[PDB]
Design a binder for these strands. Structure first.
Length: 151
DNA sequence: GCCATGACTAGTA
DNA sequence: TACTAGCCATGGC
């Protein structure tokens, strides 16, 4: 567990994904088995979504996944039930994560998301139809949804 | 733990 | 559409 940095180029620009050999700690969209394993998935999602499940998801070494919380399930459930292309409501996820009367929490849960794109906090959307917000600029949410096949 | 937060909502004018 | 009065697991201290 040393936590080193490996940057990479994506159609969204460079994106620094840090982490130790125990797992992936982060993956920031700026303007060591795990990391290089995550690196593969990323290039796969991007230039080869035709079979993104053909690629193993790395280990998530980060305080949010180590303990047991709502934010936990919400994130865990976000990448296990919301597949490539699919879209889901803040609330609808809160259902998956147990407490359905807690969508607003699924929000703080989403911002708490360290591994975007890997854990698609972008497929998440306001029930009102409006494709809500995103930490790394709403622009990115557009492209992503878009690339997944949206208009 | 209590009290303030904010990437949510369904309801109402 | 535009404001709102519930509903929430966090974070702070």
């Amino acid at each position: 567990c040393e936590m080193k940095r490996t940057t990479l180029d994506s159609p969204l620009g460079k994106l620094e994904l840090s982490g130790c050999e125990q797992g992936l700690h982060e993956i920031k969209l700026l303007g060591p088995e795990p990391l290089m394993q995550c690196t593969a998935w990323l290039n796969a999602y991007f230039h080869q979504p035709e079979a993104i499940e053909e690629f193993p998801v790395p280990a998530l070494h980060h305080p949010v996944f180590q303990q047991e919380s709502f934010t936990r399930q919400v994130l865990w459930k976000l990448l296990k039930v919301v597949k490539f292309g699919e879209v889901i409501s803040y609330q609808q996820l809160a259902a998956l994560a147990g407490n359905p009367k807690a969508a607003r929490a699924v929000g703080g849960a989403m911002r708490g998301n360290p591994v975007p794109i890997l854990i698609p906090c972008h497929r998440v959307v306001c029930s009102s139809g409006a494709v809500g917000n995103y930490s790394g600029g709403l622009a990115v949410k557009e492209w992503l949804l878009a690339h997944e096949g949206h208009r």
